[PDB]
Every structure is written in C-alpha cells, then in structure tokens.
Design a protein around this motif. Structure first.
Motif, mmCIF file in Angstrom:
data_model
loop_
_atom_site.group_PDB
_atom_site.id
_atom_site.type_symbol
_atom_site.label_atom_id
_atom_site.label_comp_id
_atom_site.label_asym_id
_atom_site.label_seq_id
_atom_site.Cartn_x
_atom_site.Cartn_y
_atom_site.Cartn_z
ATOM 1 N N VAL A 1 0.813 -1.223 0.000
ATOM 2 C CA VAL A 1 0.000 0.000 0.000
ATOM 3 C C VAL A 1 0.845 1.272 0.000
ATOM 4 O O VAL A 1 0.438 2.282 -0.572
ATOM 5 C CB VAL A 1 -0.965 0.049 1.223
ATOM 6 C CG1 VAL A 1 -1.698 1.406 1.323
ATOM 7 C CG2 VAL A 1 -1.964 -1.081 1.136
ATOM 8 N N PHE B 1 1.801 3.031 -3.288
ATOM 9 C CA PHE B 1 0.660 3.412 -4.126
ATOM 10 C C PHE B 1 0.598 4.939 -4.256
ATOM 11 O O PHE B 1 1.352 5.651 -3.585
ATOM 12 C CB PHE B 1 -0.664 2.884 -3.537
ATOM 13 C CG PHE B 1 -0.836 1.379 -3.612
ATOM 14 C CD1 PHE B 1 0.061 0.585 -4.316
ATOM 15 C CD2 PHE B 1 -1.917 0.759 -2.986
ATOM 16 C CE1 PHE B 1 -0.111 -0.796 -4.386
ATOM 17 C CE2 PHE B 1 -2.091 -0.626 -3.051
ATOM 18 C CZ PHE B 1 -1.189 -1.401 -3.753
ATOM 19 N N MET C 1 -4.856 7.076 -3.805
ATOM 20 C CA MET C 1 -5.376 5.727 -3.630
ATOM 21 C C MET C 1 -5.409 5.356 -2.142
ATOM 22 O O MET C 1 -6.317 4.650 -1.687
ATOM 23 C CB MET C 1 -4.515 4.733 -4.423
ATOM 24 C CG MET C 1 -4.783 3.260 -4.137
ATOM 25 S SD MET C 1 -4.016 2.190 -5.378
ATOM 26 C CE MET C 1 -5.109 2.432 -6.776
ATOM 27 N N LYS C 2 -4.434 5.856 -1.384
ATOM 28 C CA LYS C 2 -4.352 5.573 0.049
ATOM 29 C C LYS C 2 -5.494 6.215 0.836
ATOM 30 O O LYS C 2 -5.961 5.662 1.836
ATOM 31 C CB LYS C 2 -3.020 6.075 0.619
ATOM 32 C CG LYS C 2 -1.765 5.554 -0.068
ATOM 33 C CD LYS C 2 -0.523 6.212 0.536
ATOM 34 C CE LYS C 2 0.762 5.803 -0.177
ATOM 35 N NZ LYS C 2 1.965 6.458 0.417
ATOM 36 N N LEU D 1 -8.832 4.412 0.637
ATOM 37 C CA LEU D 1 -8.731 3.127 1.328
ATOM 38 C C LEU D 1 -9.149 3.231 2.785
ATOM 39 O O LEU D 1 -9.560 2.241 3.389
ATOM 40 C CB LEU D 1 -7.298 2.583 1.272
ATOM 41 C CG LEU D 1 -6.838 1.817 0.035
ATOM 42 C CD1 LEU D 1 -5.342 1.535 0.128
ATOM 43 C CD2 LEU D 1 -7.629 0.526 -0.102
ATOM 44 N N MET E 1 -0.789 -5.419 -7.296
ATOM 45 C CA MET E 1 -1.714 -5.216 -6.189
ATOM 46 C C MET E 1 -2.375 -3.853 -6.310
ATOM 47 O O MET E 1 -3.516 -3.663 -5.882
ATOM 48 C CB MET E 1 -1.006 -5.341 -4.827
ATOM 49 C CG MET E 1 -0.540 -6.751 -4.457
ATOM 50 S SD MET E 1 -1.619 -7.999 -5.154
ATOM 51 C CE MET E 1 -3.193 -7.618 -4.352
ATOM 52 N N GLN E 2 -1.676 -2.923 -6.953
ATOM 53 C CA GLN E 2 -2.230 -1.601 -7.180
ATOM 54 C C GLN E 2 -3.408 -1.710 -8.148
ATOM 55 O O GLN E 2 -4.465 -1.109 -7.922
ATOM 56 C CB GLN E 2 -1.136 -0.655 -7.708
ATOM 57 C CG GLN E 2 -1.577 0.775 -8.005
ATOM 58 C CD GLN E 2 -0.432 1.661 -8.478
ATOM 59 O OE1 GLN E 2 0.699 1.528 -8.006
ATOM 60 N NE2 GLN E 2 -0.717 2.558 -9.425
ATOM 61 N N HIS F 1 -5.129 -4.469 -8.659
ATOM 62 C CA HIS F 1 -6.101 -5.165 -7.817
ATOM 63 C C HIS F 1 -6.919 -4.148 -7.026
ATOM 64 O O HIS F 1 -8.148 -4.098 -7.139
ATOM 65 C CB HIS F 1 -5.384 -6.166 -6.895
ATOM 66 C CG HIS F 1 -6.223 -6.680 -5.763
ATOM 67 N ND1 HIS F 1 -7.047 -7.776 -5.888
ATOM 68 C CD2 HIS F 1 -6.257 -6.334 -4.453
ATOM 69 C CE1 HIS F 1 -7.628 -8.026 -4.728
ATOM 70 N NE2 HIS F 1 -7.156 -7.172 -3.838
ATOM 71 N N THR F 2 -6.223 -3.309 -6.267
ATOM 72 C CA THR F 2 -6.867 -2.267 -5.458
ATOM 73 C C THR F 2 -7.772 -1.370 -6.287
ATOM 74 O O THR F 2 -8.909 -1.117 -5.910
ATOM 75 C CB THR F 2 -5.815 -1.381 -4.749
ATOM 76 O OG1 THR F 2 -4.980 -2.207 -3.919
ATOM 77 C CG2 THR F 2 -6.488 -0.273 -3.908
ATOM 78 N N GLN F 3 -7.260 -0.902 -7.419
ATOM 79 C CA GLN F 3 -7.987 0.032 -8.275
ATOM 80 C C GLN F 3 -9.363 -0.505 -8.688
ATOM 81 O O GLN F 3 -10.366 0.219 -8.670
ATOM 82 C CB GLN F 3 -7.146 0.335 -9.527
ATOM 83 C CG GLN F 3 -7.780 1.312 -10.510
ATOM 84 C CD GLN F 3 -7.889 2.717 -9.952
ATOM 85 O OE1 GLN F 3 -7.070 3.139 -9.134
ATOM 86 N NE2 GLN F 3 -8.917 3.449 -10.378
ATOM 87 N N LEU G 1 -11.747 -0.899 -5.201
ATOM 88 C CA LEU G 1 -12.112 0.247 -4.371
ATOM 89 C C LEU G 1 -13.587 0.662 -4.442
ATOM 90 O O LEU G 1 -14.210 0.876 -3.402
ATOM 91 C CB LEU G 1 -11.233 1.435 -4.743
ATOM 92 C CG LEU G 1 -9.830 1.440 -4.131
ATOM 93 C CD1 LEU G 1 -9.008 2.580 -4.730
ATOM 94 C CD2 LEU G 1 -9.879 1.556 -2.608
#
Ligand code: HEM
Ligand code: HEM
Ligand code: HEM
Ligand code: HEM
Ligand code: HEM
Lengths: 237, 238, 237, 240, 238
Positions: free
Chosen positions: B111, B114, B118-119, B122, B157-158, B160-162, B165
C-alpha cells in the motif's frame, strides 16, 4: 411471481443435492408417509417467498437421490428454507450432497451479435412434461478473463451459433456463480431427448471457447424433473 | 472496546473453524439438546475476556457445513484451547470438524508504494449492516508470484486495489497472512448485504493480472450469514 | 542417550496422526479413564526401545487431535508400537489420519557451503517448553533431480542463507523419506513464535528452489507439544 | 513335493495380485475366543487354496496408512485369485475387513534386457538378499504418454541407465516387476524386499536422477510399506 | 432376437452401476438374507422385456466394489426406475452406490473414411466364451482432440483401429458415448477369457498418437467376471 422468478434477472438460484441415509429404511412406512406430508407442508409454507422444483437423482447421478432447484430474491430465505428442510424427520436422514448458488443476469455478450441470431434466441424451448435435467458447473480459466471484450463476445457467438438449433429440444438457463462458490457459472438444461443434448454438448466441445473451461462438470448432475410428491412417494413404499 | 483492537490491529492471529452437526444428535430427546446448548453459551462468556468469537450460519449456504467460528486471539494456543473445549462439550461431541484456517493480521506490504490519492480512498472500510452475509476465500499464490520483485508485485496489487475500491462502499474486507500455518498464503474475508456487488467485485478482479497467480482460489469458498450464536443453536432444539 | 535419537543418523522417524471417533463420547467416563490409562502404560513399556513425543492437533489442524513423533533405530519397533497403540480400547476409537516415515542423514549439500555459513548452521534454535510444532512433507519435482550437484548445492545455499537468521526463534529437523512413502522429505519445526515461522516460510517461497516443491504441505500439520497425559486427560472428562 | 511354489514366484504368465485390507474397529468388540476361532477359519481356507495359488502375507499396520494387512497372491488365472479373495472376505474375519486397494499384474519376458551389454545381463542374474521377516515395498507406476510415443531403442537405452544405477543394490534388495496395464489404473507393479531400508531409500533416490524418472506420471500413490511375515503372526495379533 | 437388439443397435442407452456390500449385512440372520436375495431376483424378472441387465462379480478384482450391473435400455428413465428399486430392496439398502456411468451406443463416425480393407476385418464379432473377464474403461478426451478437424481425428482412429484389430481374436468390445450425461466422453467395454492379450492390446494402443489425447484413462479401471446374478448374491447368504 411464478412467471417472474423462472425468467427475470436479479433472481438467485440454488442447486441443492441430498443423499438418503440407510437408516431411513429402518423406519416404519406409516412414520415415513407422515414425514413425507411434513415436507409437502413445509414447502407450501415457503410458497410466495420462494420457488422450488425437485429432481430425482437416485439411479442417474452418483451419490445423490434428490435435488432442489430453488429460486429466491435473497439467499438468506433460501438458507432458512434449507435449514428447515434439513431439520424435518426426513431431512434429519439426509446427507447434504452438494450446493451451488448463482444469480440470473441480463446477457453481457449478446448485444454484439447479429440481429438474426437474437431472433432465434427469442424461442424459449420445447413443450414437455417430466423431462430429464442436467446441471453442469463451470470454471473458466484465467486466460479467458485476460481476453478483451471483443474477443470473448466473438467466441460466445460461435458458442451460440453452434447451439441454437438445439433449442428445438433443449431448454437452458445460465447463472452467474462467481464469488458465491468454487465456480463461475451454473448451467441448467431440460430435455426429453438426451441424444440431442449429448450432440449439443459435443458440438460445443469443438468451438474455441471450450478449451478455456478449466472445470467442466465435476459433478455433472443428471436427474429427472418431477413433483415432490412422486419423489417422496418413492421414499415411503 | 477491545473488539476493535482485535478486528483492526496487526499482530492478531485470526482463525476460521467450520463444523457440521452429526445425525445422531436428533436421535436425542429435545430436552437433552437444549441443555447442551447452555453449556456452549457459557463456555463462550468464559472465554469472552481473552478472545473474540463470531459465529456464522453456514447451514443452507455451504455444503458439508452448518456452523462457523471466526476467532481472534493474540496466541493460537488460546484459540486451540477454546476450540478443543468447544468440541469437548456435549454439543461439540456431535460436531465433525469441517475445516480450519489460521492467519495473522499484518502491516500492509504494497500500500505504501501506491498513489497518495489511492491511500485516502482506502481509509473507508465497507458498510455497516446487521446480519450480513459473509464470505471467506483462502488463497495460495504460485511460485511465479514469489519470484517477482516488489515493484512488479506492488503494481499488480495496485491494479487489484484500483478495480476493488468502488466496491469498498458495500463490502467490508479483511486479510490474513496464513503462510506456514496451513496449506495457504492468504485468508480473505468479506461482509456484505449485497451479494451481486460482491460477485461483480470478484469478476472485476478476475481480469487484473494478479488473478493468474492465484494457484488456489477458494476450495472451499465459504458462504454464510453472520448471526449471534443463540439464533443458530435454537434451531437444534426444535 | 534419550537425545541420541533426536540428533544421530540412521534414526528412523515416524509421524502419526489420529482423529477421535464420536462413539468414544458415547462411552462411559469409567471406560475412557480405563482406556487412557492403558495407553499411558503401553507407552511407558516402549520407553526404553524408542522415543515418543506427543502433540495436540485438536483445534489447530483439521481432522486431527493427536500426533506422535516417534524416533526409532528400526521401523519394525515403531510398527509394533503403533499397531499395539491402535489396538488399545482408546485406539479402537481413533481413525488413522496419516503416516510418514523418514530417516535422518548427514547433510548432502552443506560441505559445499561457505566457511562462515557452516558456523551459523551448528547453532541451535531456541529452547522453550510446550512450543508450537509444524510438520511439512515435501515432494521435489523431477527437474530437481535432473540438476547437477553444483546446481542443487547453490540453490540449497540460497535456502540456508535466507533461513539462518530464523534460528533465533526456531528449531528444525529434516528427515529423508524417499521410498518409504509418497514424499522425499519430512521437515519438522518447533517454535514459540509463529509470526517468525510465517516470515521464515515466505523468505523461502522467494528462493529459486521453491518452484521445485511439487508438493508443499498437504497437509501442513500445526500442533502444540504436550505430554500425552495432558492430551488424553481432555478425553476422559 | 512342491517346486511349483517358486514356479509362480519366478515364471512368466503368472498373474500376481496385491490385496490390502483394513480391519473394522468393531472387530475388537469381539471376544478373544471368537477371534481365534475366526483366525483358524482363515488359516484353513488358505491351506485349502494352497494347491491352486500361492499366498504371502504382510503386516502393513503401523507402516502404511489406512491398511493393516496385505496379501501377495500369485495365480495362473485371476478367477482363482478372485474366488480366494471373495471367500477370504467371506470368513467371519473377512466379514469385518474393508478392501483397501487392489493391483493386478502379470510377470513377463523382459523387453529391454536383451538389448543390453552381456556384462549387464550377468550382474542381473545376481540374486537379492536372503532374509527372514524382511521389509517389503510396493510401488505402482504409470508411465506418461511421452514414454510410449518413444521408439524401442530410446526406451531400451533409458532402461539400461535405470538398470545400471540399480544393479549395486541387488546385494541388499530383492525385486520383482509386474505388467499391470489394462488391469487397473497403472502400467507396472514393482515389488521389493529388504532388511535394509536406508539402502532402499538410496536405491530410489538414484533412480530419481535418471532420465526415465520424468516419464513416471504416477510414482507410488500409494506407496505401500510393510513387513513380510507368516500369516499366523499377523492373525495372532488380531486377537491377543 | 431382442437380446442382440440392445447389445448392437443404436439409440440404446447403456448404464454401468457399481455397488459395495455394507458390513452390518453379516450381522443379519441368514434367513433374513435369503429372503432379501429373492426380492432382488424377482425385481429383475419384472423389468425383463423392458430392459437388459447383466451382472459382474467385481469382488476380489476391483477395489471398493463387489458387484456391477450393465443395463441396456432405450430410455434412461426406465433404467433409473429399475435402479432406485434395486437400491430400495432389503439387500440394496445395504449397498453403497460405488459409481454410475451412462452412454448411448451409436453408428460409427470415422469407419466410413477407413480403407475398404479395414472395414472388412471389423465385421468380426469376437471370441466364443462363457463367463469371461470383463473390463470397463471410461474416457475423456482433451480439448486439443476436439479442436482437430475431421480428417485428422479419422487418421488417428484409423491408426487406433489398425493397431487394435488383431486383438479381436480374443476380445469383444462395445463403445458408449457418454458426453453430457456424466464427466466422460466415452465408455469402453471389453470381454475376454485371456487377459494377457487385452493387456498387450492396451499397451499396443498406448503407443498410437490418439492416446496422448486421453486426459483421463480409467479412474476407475473396472475389472470383473461376468456371471448370472444368482451366483453372485448366493455368496452373500452363507
Ligand atoms: C441451446 C443451448 C445453448 C444456447 C442457446 C446458449 C447460448 C448462450 C448465450 C447466448 C450466451 C451469452 C450469455 C451472456 O452474454 O452472458 C451463453 C453463455 C454461456 N454458456 Fe451457453 N448456450 C447453450 C448451451 C450451453 C452449454 C451446453 C453449456 C455448457 C455445458 C453452456 C455454457 C455457457 C457458459 C459457461 C456461458 C457464459 C460464459 C461467459 O459469460 O464467459 N451453454 N450461452
Ligand atoms: C473489495 C475491496 C478490496 C480492496 C480495497 C482490496 C485491496 C487490497 C489491498 C490494499 C491490499 C494490500 C496488501 C498489502 O499491502 O500487503 C490487498 C491484498 C490482497 N488482496 Fe485485496 N482488495 C479487495 C478485495 C479482494 C478480494 C475480493 C480478494 C480475493 C478474492 C482479495 C485478495 C487479496 C489478496 C490474496 C492480498 C494479498 C496480496 C499479496 O500479498 O500477494 N482482495 N488487497
Ligand atoms: C531455520 C530454518 C532452516 C534452516 C537453517 C534450513 C537449512 C537447511 C540446510 C542447511 C539444508 C541442507 C541439508 C543438506 O545439505 O543435506 C536444508 C535442507 C532442506 N530444507 Fe531447510 N532450512 C530451514 C527451513 C526450512 C523450511 C522452513 C523448509 C520447508 C518448509 C525447509 C525445507 C528443506 C528441504 C525440503 C531440505 C532438503 C533439501 C534437499 O535435499 O533437496 N527448510 N535446510
Ligand atoms: C533394485 C534393483 C533394480 C534393478 C536391478 C532393476 C532393473 C530393471 C530391469 C533389468 C528392467 C528390465 C525389464 C524389462 O526389460 O522389461 C526393469 C524394468 C522396470 N523397472 Fe527396475 N530395477 C530395479 C529397481 C527398480 C525400482 C526401485 C523401480 C521403481 C520404484 C523400478 C521400476 C521399473 C519399472 C517401472 C520397469 C518397467 C520397464 C519400463 O519402464 O517400461 N525398478 N528394471
Ligand atoms: C480391441 C479391439 C478394438 C477395436 C477393433 C477398436 C476399434 C474402434 C473403432 C473403429 C472406433 C471408432 C468407431 C468410429 O469410427 O466411429 C473406436 C472408438 C474408440 N475406441 Fe476403440 N477399439 C478397440 C479397443 C479399444 C481399447 C482397448 C480402448 C481403450 C482402452 C479403445 C478406446 C476407444 C475410444 C476412447 C473411442 C472413441 C473414438 C471417438 O469416437 O473419438 N478402443 N474403437
């Protein structure tokens, strides 16, 4: 919503298998027929909230006697219903075979098909009572998701093209199961003719898509559609 | 109070324990059944100081399972004791252990690398709902994944996160590191009132590059509904 | 003496898991206390020939309550003991979970390591009482055997380098299992700190070797070291 | 007057069978008097079949998972083996036995040995180890499709490497090989006796390093470890 | 007449059903068993004319199996009905269903594109023997196999046939198309008094190119002996 659950989208569908314990036969016939009536009444109780169809797997599908196809608008109601069902004197003598959930959607790839192909899709199948029924769960490989929309659409078109003439004698329904269990799709078929369904499935083994089916069946559930009465009547005599 | 100190902090072992109820349980008199329940309720209150325990009704949503515990503790031994005790009870004696998964909660690995934007998005963590569905998916990543360097993994993973969210609105999540405690790397856990959102959420993540590296994905995929333990046991009395 | 088995080569090691039947609880408290005492006494008889350590898997490892780690100088004695144990009134109510044999050898690749690295290898893990224990069986792929000595050595050197600093909080032992069952190695670890052990395993997932472990765990046995009485004592109440 | 005994353990055209059994738990709920009676029933059934087939017994309990007992049965027809085994499961003892696993294979003329050097054939004439109550190992094997696609000369060369790596272990390890394709889900059944298991371990490690090994799609699964013993010693354990 | 009309003609569903006898069965009185046996025997006589049923003693030849039925019918329903009844009988109540495989018998796909000479040698109807061994091999072909075009599959089957024909000496065969009715594409069935030939036949066929396309081969491989049901059941009375 009889017509509204078997057809509309946003409707969760569940497939529940059961195998009957041996000790069930150690019970008296009068006791079992009592147990039978209990279930028929439990179902009628849940009418209005959910839809339930029954299939006899005994003698066609290994390690299974009975299957429920349950449509609901929330899975919680389906959960409660199944826990209640498994709670009955009859249910207490059932081992849970398997369980698959999936929701019904409007199609993703169909809009980008020919107008002529969508026409042939409007047909809703054959007219038959107490047909054979097949359930095939499917997991697509990762390669498939890596594909772009245009590619998948085209593959699914070939899928359709190869299958359309089997709508003569085969009804179908598709459920999106991803994230609810270990598969992406649940496919369901009714037919009076298993030769056709066999040929139908062979034809689809030959399209490009098929190579992407990381799981194909396992289990492949074969049964026959019948009223719950006829089914339970077998478990009493 | 301490609840959020277990459900949120790092260094917290988390356990997932599945149970299926025997048939012979019903050959018992109904009065015997209800008394057995009372044993369990007390056993929990007894452990109510050291550990946190949540219950999920898996009966009717997950094959070969009726009940599930999610136990948070700062040592697995305490989790072990509670669990062997639980199974020692008259009720426990009629339960077959379905499955068992351990994983600890850690500081995020990727994280930090990132975008700042993006943080921030989250910090929001799912929705607040009562009696929600809950899903648990264990994960084993392939050797290819570990062979990668950080930047490569971090970017994956970024992505993935995107993709995930916008589902963080209607989905709570938690992640446990399971490697070396069992046959998986990660235990993923989710709460939601809306299962289509969770479904769409998973399809979305099947399309990022990380997904190809998920050697084991589910198996089992545990679907249940979160509930107070009482509601469940009451079903085993009638 | 006692320890001359936990360290020396030519010592067969066996790992035996068991799960307790339900019907055991359908037995009276009198039978169970009697049954337990039988086991306790059987073990004390073999106390001279073999070494036996016990582990509580109940609550940590699925489908397992108890584990024995038995060291012997011949597998025959280990066989006898285990067949006896399973013969006891208690044993009658145990389902055999699994069984793994492996012999302890002098290291193959270690001599071809750096002088500095051999120094840190002689050093033990940490000594603590009633610690967690993990057992991981391992099958290497065929590629691994095809590799030449120099190649395997460098790979295991990378393995060692990544693992040595975890000897702070972790004891280890390795058994060579090939040809005695369906795995090549049995690895065994004791530790008070599982977060370390967790990290230890991640580090090794990152070396080049890891890709060659065709089977990794399956099962991964997690338990806690305990005297057998304490373990059985739970099964009497 | 015998002779035929070793004529099954050595000759070709001899079906060999490997039969595992696991004993019910309730078997021990029987009185010691009931079991010993059950023992002799079996012992006599075996002596009855002593003319038609050969039978060896192995104690797998405590060495092999989900198994207590093993028979290695040689016959010249599998029906005789079938009958004997169904009968065996028919005894009051057998009535309490779950059939564990079952592997059939015939003993053949060797295929690749002829295309070896003469010196390699000589050291093969060499015998295993002479021992009483030795350990015994069984490993079923399926070759991959790649293996069968090969021509003979290539296979012969591989098996020569196999043989070459294994020869020095015929000092302390006896061996026998059965051809199982079409009778079950494997191609070969391999069988080994030894007093020294560490040598056997080494024997197997060596063969993991030859080129043949990559073609073994299945290697073990299950790997049956046991100890060879007279049937009485085994049955004596199930009552006393 | 009708005998050969099910064993040879197309449009005929064939089923392969395995059963293992429970242990608690021997705790039953012999009087109870013989009555149970007679129940089965009569049920079969009832379904005669409608279906054909053959029996195989798998006991002592196939693990976790004692008995197998081969049922031919022109509808699977009739087969289901017969089978649920059989499992309902006092005897059946003590049978665990081992496995189940359905397949239809068809007219050949590739034979026409063979040499006229290969068609000549195929008309042969096997060996003359009573109580032969019987073998069943289920088969699933890979995706590569279906991807091939007709001409190519035909040549592979031509190679298959060519290598197999000289084993019609001592081997009868029949082939069922199983796709879509269970988890396999084909069910192969063989009878022989000589198993060494059948073995060589299978070794031989392991060497053609088709074989590499057999993703699942056996699993299970069912070995048995053909027998009338009476002799088999009589074993369970003494
Ligand atoms: C008369 C027979 C059939 C017809 C008309 C048919 C037609 C279609 C159509 C139009 C779609 C697109 C739906 C969408 O956009 O999501 C579809 C999807 C799908 N079909 Fe069928 N199909 C048939 C038979 C089968 C069979 C026999 C199987 C598998 C055994 C199957 C498996 C699937 C799967 C897994 C999908 C979704 C794949 C994806 O969304 O990536 N179908 N089918
Ligand atoms: C729905 C909202 C989700 C969000 C916001 C999210 C976001 C994240 C984030 C920020 C991490 C950081 C890990 C780290 O820093 O070490 C992570 C890790 C991870 N997530 Fe998710 N995710 C979501 C859903 C999912 C789902 C649905 C799955 C699986 C079904 C999943 C599987 C994982 C796994 C396995 C990791 C560990 C990655 C590794 O270390 O290799 N996530 N996720
Ligand atoms: C403090 C932790 C560890 C240390 C110091 C360590 C060190 C070593 C060393 C020096 C060897 C050389 C043996 C030889 O040359 O014969 C070895 C072998 C081995 N180690 Fe470890 N290791 C550790 C942890 C682990 C773990 C956590 C695993 C697996 C989960 C593992 C798996 C193996 C295997 C399978 C071998 C046999 C190598 C072979 O012959 O292919 N080790 N280890
Ligand atoms: C210990 C001393 C051993 C010796 C002297 C030996 C030697 C041989 C020889 C000479 C053959 C040729 C048979 C033929 O021509 O058909 C053969 C075949 C074979 N051997 Fe061994 N071997 C030994 C150990 C093993 C072991 C330990 C295994 C497996 C665990 C094994 C597996 C096989 C198999 C599967 C074949 C069948 C031939 C083929 O691969 O197509 N052998 N062996
Ligand atoms: C022993 C004498 C045998 C003969 C004469 C024979 C002949 C044939 C022929 C001619 C076909 C294709 C029929 C057509 O063209 O439509 C066929 C199909 C097939 N056979 Fe055989 N075979 C024999 C043995 C075997 C054995 C031992 C196996 C497997 C262990 C086997 C596996 C198959 C399979 C899987 C098919 C399906 C081919 C397809 O339609 O894709 N056959 N057999």
């Amino acid at each position: 919503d009889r017509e509204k659950l078997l057809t509309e989208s946003g409707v969760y569908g569940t497939f529940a298998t059961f195998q009957m314990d041996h000790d069930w036969w150690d019970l008296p016939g009068e006791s079992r027929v009592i147990s039978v009536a209990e279930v028929k009444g439990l179902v009628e109780q849940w009418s209005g909230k959910i839809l339930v169809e029954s299939y006899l797997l005994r003698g066609l599908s290994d390690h299974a006697d009975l299957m429920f196809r349950v449509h609901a608008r929330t899975l919680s109601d389906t959960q409660q219903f199944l826990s209640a069902f498994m709670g009955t004197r009859l249910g207490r003598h059932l081992t849970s075979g398997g369980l698959l959930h999936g929701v019904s959607k409007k199609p993703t790839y169909v809009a980008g098909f020919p107008e002529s192909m969508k026409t042939e899709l409007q047909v809703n199948g054959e007219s038959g009572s107490r047909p054979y029924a097949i359930v095939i769960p499917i997991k697509k490989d990762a390669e498939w998701w890596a594909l772009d929309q245009e590619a998948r659409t085209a593959l699914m078109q070939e899928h359709t093209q190869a299958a359309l003439p089997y709508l003569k004698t085969v009804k179908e329904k598709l459920y999106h199961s991803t994230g609810l269990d270990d598969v992406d799709f649940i496919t369901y078929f009714e037919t009076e003719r298993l030769e056709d369904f066999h040929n139908l499935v062979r034809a689809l083994q030959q399209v490009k898509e098929f190579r992407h089916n990381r799981r194909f069946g396992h289990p492949t559930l074969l049964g026959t559609m019948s009223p719950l009465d006829e089914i339970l009547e077998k478990f009493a005599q």
